[PDB]
């Protein structure tokens, strides 16, 4: 009832969740893509694959 | 399987005969016992009957409902005490249970959807009919309209699958892998809502805070699982598409779990706090589920069973306190250890289970989702540490604050705990531990 | 065939049963190295070393066969991993050496 | 050890007497569920 | 009223305290308590948990362990790798030769 | 057919008029049947006890006269260029015919007259207008094969039909906006087939046939009257209002089966985007139906207390209860129906 | 057989045995519906629900009779429907050519490495 | 000790539904007899077969 | 979350339902005139 997109609220909400989600979702995509690239290229011998049983 | 269905159908007339409230649960408890004997299931479907089967996955979820739906009758004895349309109330649960049994026991995807949502309307009557506070309207719509808004588009995604597969049966679907981006969003955004996901959870705190005790049980007990159960059946043929957008869901749920835990610490309502605790754990369930690994799948199935029993359990205790103190706010509810010390024991055990305390079945499932997530990416250790830390931060605040301090001053005299309440709490927690012995069955559905 | 389901269902269950046998043939080999370390200490490195060599080989063969399929792994998926693996082997040699 | 040409009934495949009793008179044999499922998948595949 | 030192020491079997199952008919309240306990506890938990324990081996997990030993002995004696790395023997397979593939994406 | 022997005639001549239209093998023959239908409805619609009713008799007349006039205009023009009742390749001249027919049925862009004439109709009049009068117009549109014009009406019909209905409190005016939405589903079902449309129309008329009686039997015309309405068993009142959910097409009830078959065929025909706009917009329609159920689902109300008794007609109520029973339990009879396969 | 002949696929052989509830579900479903409908009418009029059983028997009897009649017509419609498909297949053997049944040996489709 | 009365006599009706429910599905298994003792994993040896089919 | 969720959506939907009310609060002539405009455009395109 007393909420208004006043910029302070947007600035509050922006850094509150959206960027932690965006920055961290970016980190997950980045790290897995690098790790995935090795596997697709055939870099890691099956001896050295981590979490064989996950 | 029809043994269960026809048993329930012929128990419908018991709603009409008078002075049959208590004879109903016994028929509802006895059938659970009968259902408890027919466990000879496997990964593949078994006991076919015209379209109704059951595998190890469906069995545990069905048996969970029969147990929970039976406890609803114990918990809602106030409806019997005031003859507040008890006959209609009974018919609502008997109908609701039948929809659940069919939903899990359905072998074809179209049926699952057919009874998926259809169970909603018996729930919607439950909230409006027997809810106290005026907000059951403004919470009645949220439950109905979030679900319908995202389930109706799912119906299109289901039909588009006939024209390719030619059938709905789950086993025949797994042979295919689809590549269409929108179809992925038309069979998971419909279940991501009901899990719920962190950003689309706005209905959950409203439905649970306003619904009656019984409605709180089933809403937290089985409705949050129909979203989870549905995913377990439809990521089988969305494996390829799941890899392109999973990182979006994992991040949201993981970060969503942490942020909600802080929101839990700033709550002041018992019902609200327990409801927000549901989103916290359901974030881990969804996170591990989308990891798609053997552990993340078996673990997710386990935790859904355990969490439902617990969160359903914790809604008993809030109702017990609310029934006497008359207010559900934390400020009113203090030092209950000094009014109802016998009750405080059950507060602890159910509370401890919620924070993944041993030897509960909850810790077995949580160990596994944690394993799958870590294997998915070592970066997930950051919040997965925070989320498990804060998942106890509010649980202690829930338990300690409501039980420990000095008693409220304005409270008027009220009855002490009754045997019914204690028996209700035992049936919630005691299976939640003994199930660890035979996790053999309620874990390896794959 | 690509259209019959009973024959696929026959093999999927057979694959799953063989998976259990192969899951725990690893488990037995782990228990051997488990037991040798307890029955041979303090001088257990010399004696468990061969047993662990048996164990690590089994894990890799286990991981080459059922590995990286996740849940929903079935006869079709496992067999198709093998077909892709073999093609890569003749083209790029054994895995771990990279592509050409 | 199984005799040369002997077909055990499904309940014969288990040790404890109580478990023999349950599988014989309380539960469907594993063959039954296996071979019903084959039929149902056969008919369902014919739909598509 | 003005109860006495013996109205508190000579409990009147006239009023009754309810066990939470009914508040009007005393015999009904005890009657529901007794039956509810029996099914929920004497059957679901005692008989159920007992029956669970002696449930037949339905997942074929005990059976596997027997295979894991027999299957291991036969192949440890047979000079074959203890876990076969091939779902079907590689020589039995018929690879599509390179020209057939035509740049199809190959993954590991 | 309520007051005099004359009302009996006008009803029959309405049936004959509609039949002549849908059995006519040429535009001109079809147009005649519309004229027969026109004067069969007006006397049924005009009653001088109401200042409002005569106004309703007007707006309908001016609209329908214009529609038939423009309809005949294009039909003459259509066969002036093709010399056939049919056009080999659809073009503007066929669009004009479509525009008239939509106005004849009050589709979205030309629906304005339709709710605005519902203030001054008895409930039994609204049923004749809502259900039967939409047969002849919509059934001729099946002949014309323009997509975009028909497609536009659907998109606007579901939208305008829903959003407009939120603001009403008069049940007669509310049902009009509700009917505009169901009209949108028909036209969507009409670009794909007719057998679906014939099925869907029959179910739509069925539900409206039910809801009209409940208001007609108890003479309710405003939302407040629902809360003030007295019923012996609040269980009974609770169950009667469970027909609105079927009118909302919720699957546990019979009223979804019609919506269901329209999606299993639209999806089969790859019209995915349409269904999104339609099914999504139906929620808003489902909304104000629940606003009616506020008077039933909650089931203890503050009500005026100078009534203890229900005075109701038997035969209407006798037929209404039968129809209501299927409207809640009609789903398991889909097995019997063999018109979808 | 290794062949995919569409006409063979449609053509029946009598092997299938219809379920037990199949020839009785429509009669029994309508019969119960008729009785239940009669139960409302008394309830709606606040009459004892089992009073005037004459109407129950009529609605139950009428339900069964209607169910059996329409069920009889249903099978004719289904029997005719397949007959149409079989005839149309025969008329256009080119548009529904016999195709050979591949097996997984002679195909190479992708797999999804979860990792 | 049960604390059951004549009202539980109505319980026979739900138990009636159980037997009827049991009967149908049992009747359904008798309709499932075309892979019965014929599958590759349980199929009887070709020749000199048991008179009564398993299950 | 509820700015893009419900409470605002309702505040917008109700606001439009007000606007459609005024669009329905006109003389019968205006609506028919709107129809005639549509016809005239189709006729004009016919000559082209
Ligand atoms: C750390 C913990 C240590 C281990 C546990 C400590 C407690 C030991 C209990 C008894 C152990 C035992 O003998 O067998 C247990 C028993 C053997 O079962 P089994 O492995 O299937 O059969 C073994 C062979 O088939 C057949 O071989 P068998 O010769 O062993 O046959 C068993 C025979 C052996 O005879 C004996 O039990 C007595 C032997 C000791 C007698 C002392 C003689 C010296 C003087 O009789 C029994 O054991 C009957 C079981 C009685 C269980 C009663 C449980 C419920 C009441 C408790 C509350 O296993 C169980 O305990 C399961 C029963 C639990 C059911 C409870 C369900 C909840 C309701
Ligand atoms: C001068 C008036 C004398 C008294 C009235 C006529 C007496 C002679 C009876 C002739 C037959 C009835 C004529 C009549 O009243 O019109 C039909 C009147 C009603 O007249 P109406 O004004 O409602 O119009 C009738 C319209 N049609 C013909 C289409 C039905 O009654 C009937 O329609 C059915 C009953 C006919 C028998 C009545 C005697
Ligand atoms: C937020 C508000 C916006 C929500 C999203 C709106 C956009 C929805 C997508 C656009 C409409 C439908 C698109 C479509 O037609 O998808 C078809 C696609 C291609 O499949 P195919 O059948 O092979 O195409 C024909 C042959 N070439 O294959 C498919 O996609 C078919 C599978 C079903 C697709 C249903 C898509 C609609 C989902 C609506 C969600 C509504 C929002 C819910 C929250
Ligand atoms: C719970 C009660 C919910 C009732 C919902 C009814 C929907 C099921 C239905 O109507 O069909 C079920 C089917 C009956 O028909 P069927 O045996 O398959 O044979 C052909 C019939 N002419 O029979 C069955 O599939 C058995 C299971 C449902 C009926 C018992
Ligand atoms: C398969 C197709 C047939 C399905 C079954 C059709 C019949 C369902 C309705 C049968 C019950 C009718 C009588 C009844 O409503 O139950 C009695 C009572 C209703 O309330 P009350 O007004 O006090 O009734 C007095 C009459 N004994 O009972 C109640 O309080 C609740 C009754 C259930 C209401 C359901 C709507
Ligand atoms: C991502 C964001 C979250 C998903 C958005 C889901 C929207 C559902 C919003 C909702 O809950 O309903 C909104 C409204 C009822 O809202 P309510 O809380 O009851 O306000 C008080 C009413 N007296 O009820 C309605 O507005 C009717 C439902 C309309 C929903 C679709 C409208 C889209 C229009 C374009």
TrEMBL record, chain A:
Subcellular locations according to the entry: Mitochondrion inner membrane
Transmembrane segments: 10-28
Protein family (similarity comment): Belongs to the complex I NDUFB4 subunit family.
Protein name per Swiss-Prot or TrEMBL: NADH dehydrogenase [ubiquinone] 1 beta subcomplex subunit 4
Organism per entry: Drosophila melanogaster (Fruit fly)
UniProtKB/TrEMBL annotation, chain C:
GO biological process: mitochondrial electron transport, NADH to ubiquinone
Localization: Mitochondrion inner membrane
Primary location class: mitochondrion
Disulfide bonds: 36-48
GO cellular component, one term: mitochondrion
Topology in the lipid bilayer: Peripheral membrane protein
Keywords of the record: Electron transport, Membrane, Mitochondrion, Mitochondrion inner membrane, Respiratory chain, Transport
Family per record: Belongs to the complex I NDUFB10 subunit family.
Record protein name field: NADH dehydrogenase [ubiquinone] 1 beta subcomplex subunit 10
Native organism: Drosophila melanogaster
Source taxonomy: Eukaryota, Metazoa, Ecdysozoa, Arthropoda, Hexapoda
Region of the whole protein represented: 55 to 154 of 159
TrEMBL record, chain E:
Alphabetic keyword roster: Electron transport, Membrane, Mitochondrion, Mitochondrion inner membrane, Respiratory chain, Transit peptide, Transmembrane, Transmembrane helix, Transport
Any one GO CC term of the record: mitochondrial inner membrane
Keyword Transmembrane tagged: yes
Membrane topology: Single-pass membrane protein
GO biological process, one term: mitochondrial electron transport, NADH to ubiquinone
Superkingdom of origin organism: Eukaryota
Transmembrane spans: 36-54
Keyword Mitochondrion: yes
Compartment(s): Mitochondrion inner membrane
UniProt function note: Accessory subunit of the mitochondrial membrane respiratory chain NADH dehydrogenase (Complex I), that is believed not to be involved in catalysis. Complex I functions in the transfer of electrons from NADH to the respiratory chain. The immediate electron acceptor for the enzyme is believed to be ubiquinone.
Subunit description: Complex I is composed of 45 different subunits. Interacts with BCAP31.
Similarity comment text for this entry: Belongs to the complex I NDUFB11 subunit family.
Protein name in UniProt: NADH dehydrogenase [ubiquinone] 1 beta subcomplex subunit 11, mitochondrial
Recorded name of the encoding gene: NP15.6
Whole-protein residues included: 43 to 150 of 150
From TrEMBL, chain H:
Keyword Mitochondrion: yes
One GO CC annotation: mitochondrial inner membrane
PANTHER family assigned to the protein according to its UniProt record, in alphabetical order: NADH DEHYDROGENASE [UBIQUINONE] 1 BETA SUBCOMPLEX SUBUNIT 1
Protein task: Accessory subunit of the mitochondrial membrane respiratory chain NADH dehydrogenase (Complex I) that is believed not to be involved in catalysis. Complex I functions in the transfer of electrons from NADH to the respiratory chain. The immediate electron acceptor for the enzyme is believed to be ubiquinone.
Quaternary structure annotation from Swiss-Prot or TrEMBL: Complex I is composed of 45 different subunits.
Tree of life domain: Eukaryota
GO biological process: mitochondrial electron transport, NADH to ubiquinone
Topology in the lipid bilayer: Single-pass membrane protein
Organism listed in the record: Drosophila melanogaster (Fruit fly)
Family listed: Belongs to the complex I NDUFB1 subunit family.
Coiled coil stretches, renumbered: none
InterPro entries with a match to the protein in the record: NDUB1 (IPR012575)
Keywords tagged on the record: Electron transport, Membrane, Mitochondrion, Mitochondrion inner membrane, Respiratory chain, Transmembrane, Transmembrane helix, Transport
Organism placement in taxonomy: Eukaryota, Metazoa, Ecdysozoa, Arthropoda, Hexapoda
Name of the protein described by the UniProt record: NADH dehydrogenase [ubiquinone] 1 beta subcomplex subunit 1
Localization, UniProt: Mitochondrion inner membrane; Mitochondrion membrane
